[PDB]
Design a protein around this ligand. Structure first.
Ligand SMILES: [Mg+2]
Ligand SMILES: [Mg+2]
Ligand SMILES: [Mg+2]
Ligand SMILES: [Mg+2]
Ligand SMILES: [Mg+2]
Ligand SMILES: [Mg+2]
Ligand SMILES: [Mg+2]
Ligand SMILES: [Mg+2]
Ligand SMILES: [Mg+2]
Ligand SMILES: [Mg+2]
Ligand SMILES: [Mg+2]
Ligand SMILES: [Mg+2]
Ligand SMILES: [Mg+2]
Ligand SMILES: [Mg+2]
Ligand SMILES: [Mg+2]
Ligand SMILES: [Mg+2]
Ligand SMILES: [Mg+2]
Ligand SMILES: [Mg+2]
Ligand SMILES: [Mg+2]
Ligand SMILES: [Mg+2]
Ligand SMILES: [Mg+2]
Ligand SMILES: [Mg+2]
Ligand SMILES: [Mg+2]
Ligand SMILES: [Mg+2]
Ligand SMILES: [Mg+2]
Ligand SMILES: [Mg+2]
Ligand SMILES: [Mg+2]
Ligand SMILES: [Mg+2]
Ligand SMILES: [Mg+2]
Ligand SMILES: [Mg+2]
Ligand SMILES: [Mg+2]
Ligand SMILES: [Mg+2]
Ligand SMILES: [Mg+2]
Ligand SMILES: [Mg+2]
Lengths: 134, 244, 84, 46, 204
RNA sequence: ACCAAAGCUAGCUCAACAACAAAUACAAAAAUACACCAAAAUAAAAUAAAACAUUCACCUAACAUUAAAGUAUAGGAGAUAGAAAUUUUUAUCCUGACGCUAUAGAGAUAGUACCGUAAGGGAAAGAUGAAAGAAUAAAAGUAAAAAAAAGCAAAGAUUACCCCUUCUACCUUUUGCAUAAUGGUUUAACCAGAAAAAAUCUAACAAAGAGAACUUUAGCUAGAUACCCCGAAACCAGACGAGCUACCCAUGAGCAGUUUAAAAGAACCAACUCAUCUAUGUGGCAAAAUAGUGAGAAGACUUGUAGGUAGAGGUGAAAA
RNA sequence: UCGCACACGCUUACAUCAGUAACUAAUAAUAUACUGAUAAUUAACAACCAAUAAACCAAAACAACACUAAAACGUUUAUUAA
């Protein structure tokens, strides 16, 4: 859980518990080609690997074999009219790999299923305002 | 813009608000009024009026004390109310010569002092003047009880005073544990100086020590709301049982 | 509509604790759709949803925070939860 | 020979000379912070 | 909601395209004087019938669409009107729309339902403690215009999808006011037994 | 016809009255292991004295206000500095403005851009309308509209633009300037004379006059008349600087070949280090370079990372 | 014909698709350097990563052995180390 204080651990303490978890996940379509066994999650910055594993397994009942994480740096370079910098937020990315031989594929989320006036001026009129009949 | 109250009175209105308001009155009263320190370095002239030599007319003559400096070590010893005199001097004493910055330091000695009331031998840095006053007051403990706050100038002297004054007002049996006779003797001749108990413990303090002691005397960890609610409910039930 | 506090005061502890995850999962699903819609260069369907699932969670918090903060007064009498 | 390149960037030297801790260790450093707060600077210390 | 210190409200929503075009990120314009009307002194609402006392179109009656309180404007539907095209492409100008021009509140009086006349509305608190609008001139109670809501969802015609909670369940009171916190409650309910306790910890 | 030009507001002056939560001193914004804490010594000089040494108000404190009084006194008895005894003071209420409008008024739309290693410095700007959920042509500079023997550029004039005739730009500075002395491309906006002792002038009341204290042999009381702007090199206090360079202290790293019993402050000659000599370059490619040519090249050698010494000082194989 | 890596240092300037009338390039073409939208570098390398007692005079130099200017760097035993 994010932004909370954690109890200081010493020898023989109660197993740490969090009843209402504070994190939130995004499942994102991979920007590059990756094997069928890999899924990709942007997570919040303060989340550890072990956390993402347990979070995935217990909330969603996913059998995860492997997790890896990196931190993405958002550009500092775009400037305001005041010429002060806009910073896009930094964000953590995790790669998970499924244990039971399961293949994922990113669902196409947009199936495409949905639910002639010519007033052009007369070439032979020579600019005469046609509405007027005579 | 301006300030609603001048700044010299900022330092004063500091006391009129907050925790200072809860300090005991006697402490405050003692702090406010400052009896003017006995002249040490400069030499006073008794008469309020003088006769001008050249002018031949009576002149209203006043006394301005010379600013002296107390180093941090002095606060640890008994220097007799003196310290460093910072100033300038004229070489040769002709006003026409060079003016030059100069500092006169007092002469320090390492000596031991004996307390009847504290029953101890202390190693204190003293001045000649300290031993003179210790002499003229006829006792070390006499010297400490017979002297005002401004004249000692030392945290050590005033905590000495506070310590032995407390020991006097408590009538402590620990003084001379095996000899009631020496207790009688020692306590008797200082019996001129006995102060009550609530006054004695506040006498040597500094504003920080006062604030801290007061803080500690005022510490109460907040009553559980359960308590007060139970009290209120019981009050209501008893009023309801009595009205019927 | 998103959950209003008054509707939440009536639930017991276990029910709030459960509601928390029904809220959580919905929030993740919305978040994913968000990003995906941004990638496909297509406007995102019914954005209102994301506003709603926030409020309820935000609401749910308010409700539990009270039940802690009331109870800790009734027990100890220290108003603030962390020492300071 | 040719001059004006005098500043050779180092992150360790930068934080060690002008960083918040170095300021706070000495009284005058503290007053650097103080004056800089009184003028209300976006950045107090390197 | 995004607002700058000096801002002009152009009938356009604060967060909209027409608005970012109207007053781009770097504009600061002249102050707009707004005759102060406190919220409690404000006698107009959206949807009520009003009479326009001012302009080319006056003495007429109309319904109020919305009130913009910042610059103090009322909107009469299709009454005060100026013409604005919608579609404009290179060879074609399409959809000439009559558009509502905003009206100041000094030019608009509230109409009492019965005899259909303009009046000065004044707030009264009744004996029962309701806040009603009484006409000074006609001496009547003037209603306030019960009106739809922005989302267009009418509560009377509504159906639950899969994720909509049925009224009965949501209203049900399951709360049992006992002195535990969520942690001890859930832990006791789930049957998770914990034995060992925290060692002593110092706080600085 | 372009470039431009115009608004009245944002706000200022002066004066009365009196979003949590987490994270933070590790190299701040990093939950978490053995310590230490913490400290204090007169303000100086610039400047006045037409130099400068004693001396030089204000600069800390509160004490206010009307007087005693610029008096007693203190002073290279110079410049200047300067009391007290003793006296005076009716309440609050009653806020505003012969204060500024975007080169003004705050530095401010900002302590932000940006400039500095760092202490620190520090800007510029906005303008239609009820509604944009409706689309005056007036500065310099130019264009419409190259220029025809000749001459401080104009003036007298003429039918007539020239052609004739008559004339040493302007300030400042000097004995004297067309001077080949200084200054300025041009336009706009900003940009420099403040005091009331004595005096004169106009009035009040007069042996008296002033709404308290004073002055009075026509005087007193009141008004009105007055004395600039920009520039050093310096000197003093406190900060910040050894990421350049000077020298050290740690901890690393290079030096091929060829010659010689040899790593010998030896030869030859690369990498690497210096900077001899010439030519280019001189608002450069470069606020010290490039091309050739040169010295040294297992040593008092070059070089990386990280510490240290700070201006009354440091460091120095002394070139101040 | 100053090539590929790492260290230090820079911070998205990198990648894909799209647009370039005008802004960046000291010109154009088109785009690693302009504008918008979207993505992205995944740890075995690298950083972080114990104390206290005791024995041990004996250089690196292809290291036999030496030279003078006297040389950076740890093993092993014991006691405890989540
Ligand atoms: Mg990780
Ligand atoms: Mg990693
Ligand atoms: Mg520079
Ligand atoms: Mg002089
Ligand atoms: Mg002079
Ligand atoms: Mg001189
Ligand atoms: Mg002076
Ligand atoms: Mg300004
Ligand atoms: Mg910088
Ligand atoms: Mg013109
Ligand atoms: Mg002529
Ligand atoms: Mg002449
Ligand atoms: Mg001139
Ligand atoms: Mg001359
Ligand atoms: Mg000449
Ligand atoms: Mg000349
Ligand atoms: Mg000259
Ligand atoms: Mg010139
Ligand atoms: Mg006069
Ligand atoms: Mg006369
Ligand atoms: Mg001098
Ligand atoms: Mg001089
Ligand atoms: Mg250093
Ligand atoms: Mg160095
Ligand atoms: Mg060799
Ligand atoms: Mg040699
Ligand atoms: Mg040649
Ligand atoms: Mg050679
Ligand atoms: Mg040679
Ligand atoms: Mg040297
Ligand atoms: Mg010499
Ligand atoms: Mg010389
Ligand atoms: Mg790197
Ligand atoms: Mg270009």
């Amino acid at each position: 859980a994010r932004n909370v204080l954690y109890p200081l651990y010493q020898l023989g303490n109660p197993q740490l518990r969090v009843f209402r978890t504070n994190f939130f996940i995004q499942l994102v379509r991979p920007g590059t080609a990756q094997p069928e066994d890999t899924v990709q999650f942007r997570i919040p910055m303060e989340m550890t690997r072990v956390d993402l594993r347990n979070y995935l397994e217990r909330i969603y009942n996913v059998p995860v074999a492997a997790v890896r994480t990196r931190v993405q740096y958002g550009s500092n370079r775009r400037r305001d009219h005041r010429n002060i910098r806009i910073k896009k937020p930094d964000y953590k990315v995790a790669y998970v790999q499924l244990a039971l031989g399961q293949t994922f594929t990113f669902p196409d989320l947009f199936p495409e299923r949905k639910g002639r006036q010519k007033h052009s001026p007369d070439p032979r009129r020579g600019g005469v305002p046609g509405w007027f009949g005579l | 813009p301006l300030h609603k109250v001048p700044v010299g009175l900022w330092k004063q209105l500091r006391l009129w608000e907050g925790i200072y308001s809860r300090l005991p009155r006697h402490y405050l009263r003692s702090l406010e009024e400052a009896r003017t320190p006995t002249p040490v370095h400069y030499r006073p002239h008794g008469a309020k009026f003088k006769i001008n030599p050249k002018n031949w007319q009576r002149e209203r003559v006043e006394d301005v004390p010379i600013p002296v400096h107390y180093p941090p070590e002095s606060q640890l010893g008994l220097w007799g109310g003196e310290g460093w005199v910072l100033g300038h001097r004229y070489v040769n004493n002709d006003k026409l010569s060079k003016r030059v910055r100069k500092v006169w330091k007092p002469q320090l000695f390492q000596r031991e002092l004996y307390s009847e009331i504290l029953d101890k031998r202390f190693t204190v840095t003293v001045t000649m003047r300290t031993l003179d006053l210790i002499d003229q007051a006829c006792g070390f403990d006499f010297y400490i009880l017979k002297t005002p706050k401004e004249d000692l100038c030392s945290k050590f002297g005033m905590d000495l005073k506070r310590g032995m004054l407390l020991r006097l007002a408590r009538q402590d049996p620990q003084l001379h544990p095996d000899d009631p006779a020496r207790r009688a003797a020692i306590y008797d001749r200082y019996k001129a100086f006995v102060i009550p108990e609530a006054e004695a413990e506040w006498v040597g303090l500094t504003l920080d020590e006062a604030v801290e002691k007061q803080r500690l005397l005022e510490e109460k960890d907040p009553i559980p709301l359960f308590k007060i609610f139970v009290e209120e409910l019981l009050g209501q039930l008893q009023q309801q049982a009595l009205s019927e | 509509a998103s959950w209003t506090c008054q509707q939440l005061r009536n639930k017991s502890n276990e029910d709030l604790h459960k509601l928390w995850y029904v809220l959580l999962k919905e929030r993740n699903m919305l978040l994913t759709l968000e990003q995906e819609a941004k990638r496909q260069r297509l406007p995102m369907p019914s954005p209102e949803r994301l506003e709603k699932v926030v409020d309820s969670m935000d609401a749910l918090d308010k409700v539990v925070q009270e039940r802690e903060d009331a109870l800790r007064l009734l027990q100890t009498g220290q108003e603030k939860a962390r020492p300071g | 020979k040719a001059r004006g390149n005098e500043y050779q960037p180092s992150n360790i030297k930068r934080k060690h000379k002008h960083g918040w801790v170095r300021r706070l260790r000495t009284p005058t450093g503290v007053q650097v912070i103080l004056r800089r707060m009184h003028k209300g600077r976006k950045s107090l210390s390197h | 909601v995004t607002l700058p210190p000096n801002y002009r409200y152009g009938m356009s929503r604060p967060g909209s395209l027409s608005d970012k075009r109207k007053n781009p990120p770097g504009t600061r314009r002249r102050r707009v004087p707004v005759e102060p009307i406190s919220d409690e002194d404000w006698h107009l609402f959206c949807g009520d019938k009003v009479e326009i006392l001012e302009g080319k179109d006056a003495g007429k009656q109309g319904k109020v669409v919305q009130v913009i309180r910042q610059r103090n404007w009322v909107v009469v539907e299709g009454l005060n009107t100026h013409y604005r095209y919608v579609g404009k492409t290179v060879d074609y100008r399409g959809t000439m729309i009559p558009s509502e021009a905003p009206l100041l509140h000094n030019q608009v009086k509230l109409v009492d339902p019965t005899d259909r006349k303009p009046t000065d509305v004044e707030w009264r608190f009744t004996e029962a403690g309701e806040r009603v609008r009484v006409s000074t001139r006609s001496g009547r109670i003037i209603p306030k215009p019960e009106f739809p809501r922005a989302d267009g969802i009418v509560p009377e015609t509504w159906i639950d999808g899969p994720k909509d909670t049925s009224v009965e369940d949501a209203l049900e009171k399951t709360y049992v006011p006992r002195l535990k916190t969520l942690e001890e409650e859930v832990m006791e309910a789930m049957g998770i037994q914990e034995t060992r306790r925290h060692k002593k910890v110092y706080w600085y």
